[PDB]
Coordinates of N, CA and C in Angstrom, one line a residue:
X1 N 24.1 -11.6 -0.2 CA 23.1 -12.0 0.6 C 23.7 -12.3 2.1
X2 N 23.2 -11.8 3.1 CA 23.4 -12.0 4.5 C 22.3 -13.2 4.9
X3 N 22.5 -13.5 6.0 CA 21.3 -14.0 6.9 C 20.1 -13.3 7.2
X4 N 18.9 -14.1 7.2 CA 17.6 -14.1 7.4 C 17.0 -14.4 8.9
X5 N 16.9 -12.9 9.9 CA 16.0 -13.2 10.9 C 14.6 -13.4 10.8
X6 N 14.1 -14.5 11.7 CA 12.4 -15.1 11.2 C 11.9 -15.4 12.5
X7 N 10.9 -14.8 12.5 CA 9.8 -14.9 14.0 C 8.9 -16.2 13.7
X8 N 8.3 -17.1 13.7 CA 7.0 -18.1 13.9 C 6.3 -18.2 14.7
X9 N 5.4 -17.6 15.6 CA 4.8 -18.7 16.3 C 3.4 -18.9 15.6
X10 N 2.4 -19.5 16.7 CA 0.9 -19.8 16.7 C 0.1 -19.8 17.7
X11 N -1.1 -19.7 17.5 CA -1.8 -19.5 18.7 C -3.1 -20.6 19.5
X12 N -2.8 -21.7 17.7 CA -4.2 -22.3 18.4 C -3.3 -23.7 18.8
X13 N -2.1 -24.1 18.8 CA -1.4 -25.2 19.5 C -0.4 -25.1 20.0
X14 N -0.1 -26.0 21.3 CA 1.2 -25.8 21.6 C 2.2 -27.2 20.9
X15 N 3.4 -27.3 21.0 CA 4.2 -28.2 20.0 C 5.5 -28.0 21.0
X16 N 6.1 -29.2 20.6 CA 7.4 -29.9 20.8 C 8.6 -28.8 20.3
X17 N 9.7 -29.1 20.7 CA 11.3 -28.6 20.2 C 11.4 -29.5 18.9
X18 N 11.0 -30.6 18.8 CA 11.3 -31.1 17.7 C 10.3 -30.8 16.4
X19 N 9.1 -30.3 16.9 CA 8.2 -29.4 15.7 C 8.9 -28.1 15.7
X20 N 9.0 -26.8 16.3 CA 9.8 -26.0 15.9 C 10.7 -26.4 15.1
X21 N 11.5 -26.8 15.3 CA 13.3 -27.1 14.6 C 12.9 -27.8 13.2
X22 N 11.8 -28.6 13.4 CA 11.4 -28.7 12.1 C 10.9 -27.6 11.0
X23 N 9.9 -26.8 11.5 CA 9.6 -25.3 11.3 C 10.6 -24.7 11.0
X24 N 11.2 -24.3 11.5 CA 12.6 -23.6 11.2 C 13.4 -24.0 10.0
X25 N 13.6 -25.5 10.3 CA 14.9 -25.6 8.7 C 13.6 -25.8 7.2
X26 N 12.5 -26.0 7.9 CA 11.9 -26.1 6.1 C 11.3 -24.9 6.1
X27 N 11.4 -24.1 6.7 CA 10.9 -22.2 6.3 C 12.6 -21.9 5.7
X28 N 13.3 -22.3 6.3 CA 15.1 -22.1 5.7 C 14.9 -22.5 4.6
X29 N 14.5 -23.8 4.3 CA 14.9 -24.3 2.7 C 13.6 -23.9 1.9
X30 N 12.9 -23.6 2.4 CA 11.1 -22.7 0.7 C 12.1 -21.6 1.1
X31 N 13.0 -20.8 1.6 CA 13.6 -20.0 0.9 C 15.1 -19.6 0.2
X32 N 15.6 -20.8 0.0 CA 16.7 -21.1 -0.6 C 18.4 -20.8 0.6
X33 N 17.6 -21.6 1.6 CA 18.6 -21.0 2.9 C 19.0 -22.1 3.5
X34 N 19.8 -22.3 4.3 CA 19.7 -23.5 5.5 C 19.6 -22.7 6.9
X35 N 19.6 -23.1 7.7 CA 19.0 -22.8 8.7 C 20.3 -23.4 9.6
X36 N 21.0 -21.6 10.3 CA 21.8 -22.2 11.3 C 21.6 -22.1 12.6
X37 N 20.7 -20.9 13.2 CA 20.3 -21.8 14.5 C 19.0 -20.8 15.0
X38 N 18.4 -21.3 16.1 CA 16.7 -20.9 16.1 C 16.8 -21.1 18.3
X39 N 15.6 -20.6 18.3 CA 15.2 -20.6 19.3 C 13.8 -20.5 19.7
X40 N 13.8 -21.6 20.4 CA 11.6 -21.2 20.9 C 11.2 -20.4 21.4
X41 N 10.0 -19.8 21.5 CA 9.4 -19.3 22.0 C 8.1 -19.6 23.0
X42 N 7.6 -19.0 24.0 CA 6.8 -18.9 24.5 C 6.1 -20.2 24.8
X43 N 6.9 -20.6 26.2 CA 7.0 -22.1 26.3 C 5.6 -22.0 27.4
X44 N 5.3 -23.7 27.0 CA 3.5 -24.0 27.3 C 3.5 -25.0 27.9
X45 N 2.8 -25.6 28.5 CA 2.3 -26.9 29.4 C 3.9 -27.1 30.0
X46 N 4.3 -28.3 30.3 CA 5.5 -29.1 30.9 C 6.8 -28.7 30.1
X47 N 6.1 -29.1 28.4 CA 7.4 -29.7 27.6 C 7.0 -29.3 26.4
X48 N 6.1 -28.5 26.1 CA 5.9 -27.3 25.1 C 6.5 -25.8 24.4
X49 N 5.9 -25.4 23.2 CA 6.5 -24.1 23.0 C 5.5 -23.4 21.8
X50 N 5.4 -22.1 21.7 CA 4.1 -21.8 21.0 C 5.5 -21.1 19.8
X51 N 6.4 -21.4 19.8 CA 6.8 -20.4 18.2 C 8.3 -20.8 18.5
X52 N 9.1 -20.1 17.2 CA 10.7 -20.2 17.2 C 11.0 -18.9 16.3
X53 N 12.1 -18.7 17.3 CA 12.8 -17.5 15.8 C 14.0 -18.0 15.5
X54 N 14.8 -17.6 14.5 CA 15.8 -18.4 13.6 C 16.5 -18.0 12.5
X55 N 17.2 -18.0 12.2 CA 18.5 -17.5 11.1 C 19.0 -18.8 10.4
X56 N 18.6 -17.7 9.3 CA 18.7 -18.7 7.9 C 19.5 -17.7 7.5
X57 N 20.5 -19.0 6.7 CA 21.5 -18.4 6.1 C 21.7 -19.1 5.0
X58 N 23.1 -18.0 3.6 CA 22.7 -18.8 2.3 C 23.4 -20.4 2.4
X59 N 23.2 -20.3 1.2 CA 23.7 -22.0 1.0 C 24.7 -21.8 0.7

């Protein structure tokens, strides 16, 4: 098993770095992964972000 690239976003809110990154490690663990590192996407208002992509890797 290698690492897992993963797209997220959404379209009807915008959200925090710290909602992504949350997103990210519990999509890593429903698939038996940990989650070593991610990035936002498609940044909104001031201090927003509409998605993250991220790699998950095994345990």
């Amino acid at each position: 098993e290698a690492c897992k690239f993963l797209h997220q976003e959404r379209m009807d809110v915008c959200e925090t770095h710290l909602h992504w990154h949350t997103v990210a490690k519990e999509t890593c663990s429903e698939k038996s992964t940990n989650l070593h590192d991610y990035g936002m996407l498609l940044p909104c208002g001031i201090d927003k972000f509409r998605g993250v992509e991220f790699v998950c890797c095994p345990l």
